[PDB]
PDB file of C-alpha atoms in Angstrom:
ATOM      1  CA  UNK A   1     122.972 188.674 114.223  1.00 24.36           C
ATOM      2  CA  UNK A   2     122.686 186.828 117.537  1.00 26.70           C
ATOM      3  CA  UNK A   3     118.985 185.986 117.297  1.00 25.16           C
ATOM      4  CA  UNK A   4     118.654 183.593 120.235  1.00 24.48           C
ATOM      5  CA  UNK A   5     115.344 181.825 121.051  1.00 23.05           C
ATOM      6  CA  UNK A   6     115.530 183.166 124.609  1.00 20.94           C
ATOM      7  CA  UNK A   7     115.019 186.752 123.435  1.00 22.92           C
ATOM      8  CA  UNK A   8     112.525 189.110 121.799  1.00 23.08           C
ATOM      9  CA  UNK A   9     112.743 191.936 119.263  1.00 20.88           C
ATOM     10  CA  UNK A  10     110.313 194.161 117.367  1.00 21.20           C
ATOM     11  CA  UNK A  11     109.763 193.354 113.650  1.00 17.40           C
ATOM     12  CA  UNK A  12     109.934 197.049 112.758  1.00 17.08           C
ATOM     13  CA  UNK A  13     110.423 200.535 114.197  1.00 19.10           C
ATOM     14  CA  UNK A  14     107.456 201.628 116.287  1.00 19.43           C
ATOM     15  CA  UNK A  15     106.599 202.560 119.866  1.00 16.65           C
ATOM     16  CA  UNK A  16     105.623 200.793 123.092  1.00 16.17           C
ATOM     17  CA  UNK A  17     101.865 201.376 123.245  1.00 18.75           C
ATOM     18  CA  UNK A  18     101.228 199.143 126.263  1.00 18.57           C
ATOM     19  CA  UNK A  19     101.806 195.691 127.772  1.00 20.13           C
ATOM     20  CA  UNK A  20      99.721 192.532 128.161  1.00 22.74           C
ATOM     21  CA  UNK A  21     101.971 191.004 130.831  1.00 24.47           C
ATOM     22  CA  UNK A  22     104.235 192.281 133.607  1.00 24.93           C
ATOM     23  CA  UNK A  23     107.971 191.606 133.842  1.00 26.91           C
ATOM     24  CA  UNK A  24     108.538 187.874 133.490  1.00 23.92           C
ATOM     25  CA  UNK A  25     104.968 187.213 132.426  1.00 22.73           C
ATOM     26  CA  UNK A  26     104.633 183.505 131.679  1.00 23.21           C
ATOM     27  CA  UNK A  27     103.316 183.125 128.130  1.00 24.71           C
ATOM     28  CA  UNK A  28     103.250 180.229 125.666  1.00 27.12           C
ATOM     29  CA  UNK A  29     104.226 180.450 121.992  1.00 26.32           C
ATOM     30  CA  UNK A  30     101.799 182.700 120.139  1.00 28.15           C
ATOM     31  CA  UNK A  31     100.606 184.378 123.331  1.00 27.49           C
ATOM     32  CA  UNK A  32     100.850 188.171 123.184  1.00 23.95           C
ATOM     33  CA  UNK A  33     103.248 189.726 125.697  1.00 24.31           C
ATOM     34  CA  UNK A  34     102.913 193.386 124.685  1.00 22.90           C
ATOM     35  CA  UNK A  35     101.939 195.829 121.941  1.00 22.20           C
ATOM     36  CA  UNK A  36     103.430 198.541 119.737  1.00 21.02           C
ATOM     37  CA  UNK A  37     101.617 201.370 117.957  1.00 21.07           C
ATOM     38  CA  UNK A  38     103.505 202.122 114.744  1.00 25.72           C
ATOM     39  CA  UNK A  39     102.823 204.960 112.292  1.00 24.06           C
ATOM     40  CA  UNK A  40     101.001 202.355 110.200  1.00 26.53           C
ATOM     41  CA  UNK A  41      98.613 200.586 112.575  1.00 24.12           C
ATOM     42  CA  UNK A  42      98.351 198.948 115.999  1.00 27.43           C
ATOM     43  CA  UNK A  43      99.845 195.496 116.581  1.00 22.72           C
ATOM     44  CA  UNK A  44     100.475 192.957 119.345  1.00 23.79           C
ATOM     45  CA  UNK A  45     103.818 191.367 120.213  1.00 26.10           C
ATOM     46  CA  UNK A  46     103.956 187.655 121.034  1.00 22.99           C
ATOM     47  CA  UNK A  47     106.522 184.975 121.863  1.00 24.07           C
ATOM     48  CA  UNK A  48     107.950 182.487 119.366  1.00 24.26           C
ATOM     49  CA  UNK A  49     108.053 179.716 121.979  1.00 20.91           C
ATOM     50  CA  UNK A  50     106.958 178.771 125.496  1.00 19.67           C
ATOM     51  CA  UNK A  51     108.708 180.696 128.253  1.00 22.47           C
ATOM     52  CA  UNK A  52     108.682 183.701 130.574  1.00 23.83           C
ATOM     53  CA  UNK A  53     108.927 187.081 128.848  1.00 23.16           C
ATOM     54  CA  UNK A  54     111.200 189.611 130.552  1.00 22.53           C
ATOM     55  CA  UNK A  55     110.749 193.258 129.572  1.00 24.44           C
ATOM     56  CA  UNK A  56     114.037 194.917 128.611  1.00 24.47           C
ATOM     57  CA  UNK A  57     113.105 198.349 127.273  1.00 26.89           C
ATOM     58  CA  UNK A  58     111.197 200.959 129.277  1.00 24.63           C
ATOM     59  CA  UNK A  59     107.487 201.894 128.918  1.00 24.27           C
ATOM     60  CA  UNK A  60     106.779 204.358 126.127  1.00 22.53           C
ATOM     61  CA  UNK A  61     110.209 203.777 124.588  1.00 22.66           C
ATOM     62  CA  UNK A  62     110.317 203.793 120.787  1.00 20.79           C
ATOM     63  CA  UNK A  63     110.781 200.352 119.234  1.00 23.95           C
ATOM     64  CA  UNK A  64     113.304 199.816 116.440  1.00 24.24           C
ATOM     65  CA  UNK A  65     113.471 197.173 113.710  1.00 26.47           C
ATOM     66  CA  UNK A  66     115.835 194.675 115.305  1.00 29.21           C
ATOM     67  CA  UNK A  67     116.084 196.229 118.762  1.00 29.55           C
ATOM     68  CA  UNK A  68     115.463 193.933 121.730  1.00 30.09           C
ATOM     69  CA  UNK A  69     112.112 194.938 123.218  1.00 29.60           C
ATOM     70  CA  UNK A  70     112.198 192.044 125.694  1.00 29.52           C
ATOM     71  CA  UNK A  71     113.591 188.584 126.461  1.00 30.05           C
ATOM     72  CA  UNK A  72     112.536 184.950 126.858  1.00 33.29           C
ATOM     73  CA  UNK A  73     113.116 182.610 129.800  1.00 32.29           C
ATOM     74  CA  UNK A  74     113.334 179.297 127.943  1.00 32.33           C
ATOM     75  CA  UNK A  75     113.220 176.080 129.969  1.00 28.81           C
ATOM     76  CA  UNK A  76     116.972 175.566 129.630  1.00 25.92           C
ATOM     77  CA  UNK A  77     117.936 174.635 133.190  1.00 29.67           C
ATOM     78  CA  UNK A  78     114.809 172.522 133.689  1.00 28.70           C
ATOM     79  CA  UNK A  79     116.377 170.648 136.605  1.00 28.36           C
ATOM     80  CA  UNK A  80     114.039 168.066 138.133  1.00 29.84           C
ATOM     81  CA  UNK A  81     115.145 168.027 141.773  1.00 29.04           C
ATOM     82  CA  UNK A  82     112.337 168.571 144.282  1.00 30.45           C
ATOM     83  CA  UNK A  83     112.573 167.288 147.855  1.00 32.24           C
ATOM     84  CA  UNK A  84     111.416 168.921 151.090  1.00 32.84           C
TER      85      UNK A  84
END
């Protein structure tokens, strides 16, 4: 329902096989952020846009079609204020 761009969800029910990036791993659109070994075959999860991926579920947890496996830190508050 609330499919926001700053989020991530598995396409189908599977299982967290491993991870290609730690919590908040900066990855651009198309870049894999994790993986999920389903009863069918092995696959890699990637982001739909540029941003920092934040793991939500725990390692080994079973993925579900629609469940949020992670998140996305989109450049929303891209404030340009640097002065030191």
